[PDB]
C-alpha cells in the first residue's frame, strides 16, 4: 500500500515479470519428460506435474502481481474445466503471442497480428481430423492424455468402442479393491431432481423407483404467485381426466419455491384414495438454456407448457402417461426402461439437433453454442456407466480418478470436434501453411506481403509456432544433430518428432501421438486474447473502495 | 512470505539444503554406536537414538524448507509403519541417489540411472534368504533389530519357534510388573465388532461370549435405504428356517449407520421368546479390500452375500449354524473353539491364497498386493498371544513396548519375504554383482558398457553402495588399517564387518548381523523414487489459495 | 525460533554452557558452608541453600538451553523423590564425568570409561557399611542429612531405635505449638482409598471406621465393560453365601471409572436390610506393581482375582470375612486391629519377600526392583507414627517439615542399603582402590594397563574423585598448608576432613560425618548416564510439530 495507481512503464514491467514467472513454472511440467512442482497446503505436500494443478495454485505476494496472475491463470484453468488436457499449451502461447505484440507496436500492427493469427486458427479448425468410436486413434489420444497409461487408455477406448452407436455417459467412484470394476446400465442420466425431500417414498428424500408415470414440463419458475393456478390445474387433471392416467403425476419445472411445495403437499393429502403404499402421487421436480427441458419433455412424452394456467386446457391428444420405468432422486433422476416406440421419438429429436450442427459454420462448430447443443445429444442418446476406481493406497485411488476424468473429457471432445497430430507439429504446419496460402494466392499477394511478410510479422509468427516443438525435444536425441533443427519442406511433408515414453523417432501419426482438436485450438484462441489483453494494458488499480 | 514462487537455481538449492541437513541428523543415529538427538515437546525432553522418531519430529522454520522436508521424511516414516526397523537406510539412499542423479544430467542419463538401480533391486530380491521359524538366524534378526536385547530377541524368537506350524498374532499392553508376562490363547483375531454398544450382554458394549451362532456376511454398507429388507430377511429367517438354527444370528457387514442399528434393536424386542438371559439374538457387526470379509465368511461357515435382499432367498444348503465358541467385542472379535471339521475348510482356503503367491512374479512378491494376501493368511491361520510389557518405570515400560513392536514387525516380514546379511554388505554385493553380470554377459556387453560403465555411472553407483558400510565402521578398528578400505574380489567372496556391540571382526553371517529383506529392499526402492523427485523438481509454490 | 535444528559444534556448545551454568549454581549450595540462592515466585522471595530446591527452579530463556537443562536436572531431582539428601552430588559428577568423556573421544575410549566407572560403583557397593537400628552411627547420618540439627537427628534416630523390631512409617503435619508432638499408633498404612465419596459414612467423603469387613481384591481396572459382572457377583455373594459374611464388603481394585461406581450405588440401594446406621455395605476402593495389591490381599485375608466374573465362582474356602478394625479414608486407608492369627500370615508373606532379597546379586541389591520390594515390606510390617512439627512462625514450621522429611528418607535408605564415610572421601577411596585392584591383580594387569592407565583415563578419573573434597574444603584451614593437598598412601589409610559445623579436623568416621550408601552410589550411577547422554548428543530439535 505505497502506491495504488500504477501507470505506463511500471505497469507493463509487472505484467512481463508475472508472465515470465508463470511461463517458467507451468511450461516446465510439459509432456511426460516435464519436471516437477511441489505445492504447499497447510501441513502436507502435493508433489505434481499436471500443469492445471500448477497454474491454479500459483500465488504472488504483491496484490499488483496477483492481480495480473489472475488474468494469466483463469483462461488456462477454464480450458480444462470444459475440455480436458490443454492448459500448459494455453499459457505457452499467451507468453509467445505477448512477445510478438511487443515486437510490433503501433495499433495498426496489432490489428494485423490478430487477423493473421485468426486465419491460423481457421487452418487448424480445417485440419481437424474427425473420428469414429471404431477408430484405433481414440486409444492413441487417450494414451497421450494419460501420460502413457496402458491399462487406462485401453479401458476407456474399449468402453466407447463396445458401445458402437450410443455415446456412453461415464461417472466415477472411489473404489475399494486394487483392481478396477465397472457397472454397465441401459440408463439415461436426466437433469431433474426433488424439490422437497417430502415427495420421495418414506417422505425423506429417498430413491423412489416407479413403473409408470404421467409427466408435465412447465417453463416458468414457481413461487408464491402461482399457488392459485396449481390447485386449478391439479384438481382439473384428477377430476376430469382420471381415466387416461398412470400415477404418479410429475410436475417438472425450472424451480419450486417453498410456498409452492407446501401447496402440493396438501394436494396429495386432498386425494388419499390414490396413495399406494405411502408414495405421493404428485411430485414437483426442479433443474438448475431453455431447450434442456424440451429434451426432458421429449424423453418422457410430456407436453411443453409455457404458463402454469395451461394445465387446465388439456386433452387426451396432449396428455399421455408412460408405462416405462423411472428412478427419481435427490441429485438426479434416471430412466431405464424405454420402449422401442419411445426411442423412435427420441432418436428423431436427436437427429434434428444433429442436423443443426451439420449446417453450422466451421468456427461456430467450436463455439459454446455448439458444445451446449452436443451436451443435449449425450443426455438423450447415452447409456449410463459407473466405474469404481482402485489403487494401492487411498491417495493413488483419488489421484487415478482425476486421470480417468481427464481421459473421459479428452475422448469426448476428440470425437466431438476433432483430432490433430501432436508433438507441437500441427501448430507449425498451420502457421507455415497460412503464410504460404495467402502468399501463393496471386489475387491478394500484393497486400498480404505488405502487411505480414514485408513488416516481418510472418517470420516472427513462424518462429513462435516452433516454441512447443522446441520445448519438448530441445535437449533430446532429435535436436543434438545439426546444432538447431531445420524446418524445411522435407520436414513439413513428413514431420519428425520423438515419443518421449519410448525414445524412438518417427511421425506423430506413426508413433501415435495425438492432441484433441478442441484443446490445441482453444489454447491458441485463448492465447491471442490473453496476450492482447496483457500487451494492451497500461494501468493497474488496487484500490478497495 | 517474501516470495511464494521459487524457480530454478533457488529451488534446487533449498532441496539440497533440506536433504543434506536431514541426512546429517538422521544418519548420526545409525547403528548401536549411533549418536543421540534431544527433542523438545512442550515441557519435556525425549532423548532418542531411534531414527524414525528423529526423522518424524525434525522440523524447519522456513515454509519452503519444510515443504521439501516432508517429501524426504514421509517415505522413510512410511517404511516402519508397514516394515519394522528400516528408516535411516531409506534417507541415507535418498541422499546418495540424489547425489548420483545430479552428477549425470540430461534426461537420457536419468532413465539409465533408474534402469541400473532397478536391476540392482532385482539382485537384492533374489539374494533374499528364505527362512523357517526353526532357524537360529531368526534370533539374530531380532537381536539386530532390537539393538542387542539379549532378553527380548530370545523371547519373541522362542515364541515363533514354539508354535512351529501356526503364525502368531502378537499384541502389546502396558504391563505393571518389572517382569513381562505372557497370555497364550488358541484364538484367532477377527476384524469384526459391535455396530452399537446396545447389542452386547448388559446392553453397554460388554464382551459377549457365545458357544453357538449362525452367521451371515453382507458386502454392502447399510443405511436408511436398507431398513425394509432387514425386516423382510430377519422375519423370513426366524419364521421359516427356525429348525436348523443356533442363536444368536450374526449380521457381519462393512458398516451399519445409526438408522439400521435402531431397526435391529426393535427386531430383538419383537421376538422376546428367543432372548436368553438378556443376550440379544440379533447382532450387527461392522468392519472398517472385500476379501477380508470372505475370510470372515470362511472362518464362520457363513454365506457371502452381495445384497441385503438375498436374506429372503435362502435354504438349509446355504444356511449353517455353527456350534463353536465366539467372543464378540467392541474393538474386535475372537474365535477360540474350532472343530476339526471346520479347520479343514479354513486350511483349504488358506492354501488357495498361498497358491496365488506361489505363482506371483519375483518383483510382484514385494508388492502391496502380495503383502495384503499374506495379512489374510495370518488372520486365518494364527493363534492370539498378548504380552504385558514390564520395566522399571512407566516410561521404560512405554519405551520397551515400541522395541517389542519393532521386533515383531521385523520377525514377521523376515520369514514372510526374506533375510539378508547386514552391515551394509548386501548393498555392495548387489551393485558389484549387477555391474559384473551385464558386463560378463557377452550377449549385451556391447551396449551395457556404452550406457553405464563408459559414461561413469557404474563406478559412481559402486561407490555409493559403500556408503552404509563406511558410515558404520569409519572411525573403528576395521578402517584404521590400510588408510581407507580395499573392496577387492577377496572381500566380495567373504565380506568382513565389525559387530559394534562386542567389537570383534568377522562376516555378517558369522557374527549374527542380519537385516530383513523387506527393509533394505524398500529402502532402495523408496530411495530411488524420492531421489528422482528431489533431483527432478525445479519449482516451489507456497501459496495458500 | 531463528533455527529449529542445531547440529554438531553448536549443539555441544550449548550443552557445555548449560551444564557449566547448572554446575556453578547447584554446587555453590553444597555442604553446611555452601552459599545461598534467592529464588523468585510471583511476589515473594524464597532464599535457600537446599540443592534440590535450586536445581528444580533453575530456568532458561532459550528453548534450546532449557531443553538441555531438563536433562541435567530431572535425574538429580529424581534421586530425592526416592532417596533423600543426594542431588548436588549427582550434578557435580554429571559435570565431572562429562568433562572426562570429552577429554577422551573416540567410542572405544567411551566404552572403557563406562566399564571403569562401573567397577568403581561396585567398589562403592561393597564398601557399604551395614547398620542396625541400635547403632550410634544412625544419629551421625541424620546429623549429616539435617545440616547439624542437634534436636531433630536425636528424635528420629531415637524413634527408630526405641521400636527395635518393627520399622516405623512416619508422616508429618504442620504443627501448632513451638514444640513438636508425636502420636504413636499400632496401625499399618495401606494404599487403598475411596472410588467415590458416596461410599463413606454420611455419604460425603468422611472417614469410615469399620469393626468387621469382607474384602475382595480385583486386578483389572473397572469401566463400562464390567457393569454386568458386578451385578452377577454381588447378588451371588448376598443370596447364597450370606451365612459366612461380615459387613461391609470391600471391592478393592486398580481403578473405578464413573460408570461402575454408579452401578454399585444402586447395589447398596437394592438390599436396604443390610444398611447399618447409614454405612453402605458395598465399598469400591482404588489405588494409583501388581504385588502391592497382593500385599493388600494378604493383609485383609482377601482372595486375589484376575477377572471380575470370578466373584460368582466362590466358596467358604475362598471367602473369609475378617473381624478386625479398619479406617477407610479419602487419601488412604489404615488397619489398626490385627489378630495374632492374621499377623502370623502377614509375617510369613514378609519373610518370603526377604528371602528373595537375601539372594539378590550385589548390584541387584541397589536396583529399583530391590527397593520396590523393600517398600512392600514396610507396608506390611510397620507401625504408624504422626509427628506434628512446630516452630516460631508458619514458614519455619513448613521449612522444618522438609528437613524432617529429608532425615526420615535418608535414615530409611541408610539402614536399608548401607552407610559410607562422607566428606567426599569414599569416592576417592573407591577410585584409588579400583585402579590399584586390577593393576595389582596379576591375571589382568596386562590389558588393564593398556585400557585405563596407558591411555590416561585412570589418572583423569583419580583427579575427578577429588572434586567433592576440593569443593567442600578449598578455602578452609585444611587446604592452607602445603599449596594444594597431597592425596598419598598416608591419607588413604586415615583420611583427614574438616567438620564444617565445628571447625575441628579429623576422619569422617571420627567426626561423625556419614553419607548414605544409596545416595553417593545413585549420584555416581546417574552422573555417568547423564554425562554420557550430554557427551554423546550431537543434535537438538526444538520443533513443536
Ligand atoms: N509421448 C509423447 N511424445 C511426444 N510428445 C508428447 C507425448 N505425450 C504428450 N506429448 C505432447 O505434450 C503436449 C502436452 O503436454 P501437457 O499434457 O503437459 O500439456 P497440457 O495438456 O496443456 O496440460 P494439462 O494436461 O495439464 O492440461 C502435447 O503437445 C503433446 O503432443
Ligand atoms: N551389531 C551391529 N554391528 C554392525 N552393524 C549393525 C549392528 N546392528 C545393526 N547394524 C546395522 O545397522 C543398520 C541399521 O541401522 P538402524 O537400526 O539405526 O536404522 P534402520 O534400521 O534403518 O531404521 P530404524 O531407525 O527404524 O531402526 C543396518 O545396516 C545393520 O546391518
Ligand atoms: N559437617 C560436615 N562436614 C563435612 N562435610 C559435610 C558436613 N555435612 C555435610 N557434609 C558433606 O556435604 C555433602 C552433602 O551435600 P549436600 O547435603 O549439601 O547436598 P546433597 O546431599 O548432594 O543433596 P541435597 O541438596 O538433596 O541435600 C556430602 O559429601 C557430605 O559429606
Ligand atoms: Mg493430464
Ligand atoms: Mg528400531
Ligand atoms: Mg536436603
mmCIF file of C-alpha atoms and ligand atoms in Angstrom, chain C residues 26-34 49-55 76 79-80 83-92 140 143-148 406 420-426 468-469 472-473 497-504 508 511-515 519-520 523, ligand 3:
data_model
loop_
_atom_site.group_PDB
_atom_site.id
_atom_site.type_symbol
_atom_site.label_atom_id
_atom_site.label_comp_id
_atom_site.label_asym_id
_atom_site.label_seq_id
_atom_site.Cartn_x
_atom_site.Cartn_y
_atom_site.Cartn_z
ATOM 1 C CA UNK C 26 23.901 -26.001 42.438
ATOM 2 C CA UNK C 27 27.404 -26.860 43.715
ATOM 3 C CA UNK C 28 27.554 -23.421 45.408
ATOM 4 C CA UNK C 29 24.942 -24.661 47.896
ATOM 5 C CA UNK C 30 26.759 -27.912 48.859
ATOM 6 C CA UNK C 31 27.624 -28.723 52.465
ATOM 7 C CA UNK C 32 26.838 -26.612 55.515
ATOM 8 C CA UNK C 33 29.220 -23.793 54.426
ATOM 9 C CA UNK C 34 27.546 -23.594 50.995
ATOM 10 C CA UNK C 49 20.656 -23.491 50.385
ATOM 11 C CA UNK C 50 18.711 -26.672 49.516
ATOM 12 C CA UNK C 51 20.317 -28.003 46.298
ATOM 13 C CA UNK C 52 17.073 -29.764 45.301
ATOM 14 C CA UNK C 53 15.051 -26.538 45.539
ATOM 15 C CA UNK C 54 17.765 -24.739 43.496
ATOM 16 C CA UNK C 55 18.129 -27.368 40.746
ATOM 17 C CA UNK C 76 19.148 -35.111 40.259
ATOM 18 C CA UNK C 79 17.183 -39.011 43.466
ATOM 19 C CA UNK C 80 15.488 -37.142 46.350
ATOM 20 C CA UNK C 83 16.328 -41.320 48.438
ATOM 21 C CA UNK C 84 16.525 -38.058 50.425
ATOM 22 C CA UNK C 85 19.578 -35.743 50.544
ATOM 23 C CA UNK C 86 21.732 -36.537 47.468
ATOM 24 C CA UNK C 87 21.055 -34.210 44.488
ATOM 25 C CA UNK C 88 24.015 -31.794 44.427
ATOM 26 C CA UNK C 89 26.459 -34.745 44.342
ATOM 27 C CA UNK C 90 24.644 -36.075 41.232
ATOM 28 C CA UNK C 91 25.031 -32.798 39.275
ATOM 29 C CA UNK C 92 28.693 -32.465 40.345
ATOM 30 C CA UNK C 140 25.576 -39.407 62.752
ATOM 31 C CA UNK C 143 23.022 -35.119 61.717
ATOM 32 C CA UNK C 144 24.648 -35.012 58.275
ATOM 33 C CA UNK C 145 21.299 -35.090 56.406
ATOM 34 C CA UNK C 146 19.764 -32.455 58.738
ATOM 35 C CA UNK C 147 22.694 -29.990 58.355
ATOM 36 C CA UNK C 148 23.611 -30.406 62.042
ATOM 37 C CA UNK C 406 14.798 -35.460 54.319
ATOM 38 C CA UNK C 420 29.538 -44.653 53.742
ATOM 39 C CA UNK C 421 32.083 -42.177 55.187
ATOM 40 C CA UNK C 422 31.308 -38.708 53.767
ATOM 41 C CA UNK C 423 33.302 -35.543 53.114
ATOM 42 C CA UNK C 424 33.970 -36.693 49.540
ATOM 43 C CA UNK C 425 36.310 -39.365 50.892
ATOM 44 C CA UNK C 426 34.541 -42.625 49.964
ATOM 45 C CA UNK C 468 33.871 -33.274 46.061
ATOM 46 C CA UNK C 469 36.614 -32.960 48.717
ATOM 47 C CA UNK C 472 33.950 -28.631 50.430
ATOM 48 C CA UNK C 473 37.351 -27.674 51.909
ATOM 49 C CA UNK C 497 38.458 -33.976 56.548
ATOM 50 C CA UNK C 498 37.003 -30.931 58.360
ATOM 51 C CA UNK C 499 33.692 -30.761 60.188
ATOM 52 C CA UNK C 500 32.343 -27.505 58.723
ATOM 53 C CA UNK C 501 29.970 -27.049 61.712
ATOM 54 C CA UNK C 502 32.597 -27.034 64.496
ATOM 55 C CA UNK C 503 35.858 -26.390 62.630
ATOM 56 C CA UNK C 504 37.813 -29.378 64.033
ATOM 57 C CA UNK C 508 34.829 -38.687 58.656
ATOM 58 C CA UNK C 511 33.979 -36.561 63.343
ATOM 59 C CA UNK C 512 30.682 -38.370 62.637
ATOM 60 C CA UNK C 513 30.085 -37.301 59.047
ATOM 61 C CA UNK C 514 28.358 -40.081 57.111
ATOM 62 C CA UNK C 515 26.609 -40.207 53.731
ATOM 63 C CA UNK C 519 22.775 -41.660 47.616
ATOM 64 C CA UNK C 520 26.509 -41.437 46.810
ATOM 65 C CA UNK C 523 24.719 -39.887 42.260
HETATM 66 N N1 LIG D 3 29.690 -31.153 58.916
HETATM 67 C C1 LIG D 3 30.131 -31.560 57.706
HETATM 68 N N2 LIG D 3 31.463 -31.615 57.457
HETATM 69 C C2 LIG D 3 31.957 -32.012 56.265
HETATM 70 N N3 LIG D 3 31.170 -32.380 55.241
HETATM 71 C C3 LIG D 3 29.820 -32.374 55.350
HETATM 72 C C4 LIG D 3 29.198 -31.955 56.616
HETATM 73 N N4 LIG D 3 27.867 -32.050 56.423
HETATM 74 C C5 LIG D 3 27.659 -32.492 55.148
HETATM 75 N N5 LIG D 3 28.837 -32.684 54.514
HETATM 76 C C6 LIG D 3 29.090 -33.149 53.119
HETATM 77 O O1 LIG D 3 28.267 -32.478 52.162
HETATM 78 C C7 LIG D 3 27.893 -33.388 51.119
HETATM 79 C C8 LIG D 3 26.373 -33.435 51.012
HETATM 80 O O2 LIG D 3 25.919 -32.366 50.187
HETATM 81 P P1 LIG D 3 24.514 -31.627 50.448
HETATM 82 O O3 LIG D 3 23.767 -32.288 51.592
HETATM 83 O O4 LIG D 3 24.826 -30.148 50.522
HETATM 84 O O5 LIG D 3 23.719 -31.906 49.069
HETATM 85 P P2 LIG D 3 23.240 -33.377 48.615
HETATM 86 O O6 LIG D 3 23.141 -34.279 49.824
HETATM 87 O O7 LIG D 3 24.116 -33.776 47.451
HETATM 88 O O8 LIG D 3 21.747 -33.138 48.029
HETATM 89 P P3 LIG D 3 20.552 -32.338 48.782
HETATM 90 O O9 LIG D 3 20.621 -30.936 48.219
HETATM 91 O O10 LIG D 3 19.306 -33.074 48.376
HETATM 92 O O11 LIG D 3 20.853 -32.453 50.257
HETATM 93 C C9 LIG D 3 28.480 -34.748 51.475
HETATM 94 O O12 LIG D 3 29.651 -35.034 50.698
HETATM 95 C C10 LIG D 3 28.822 -34.635 52.943
HETATM 96 O O13 LIG D 3 29.953 -35.443 53.274
#
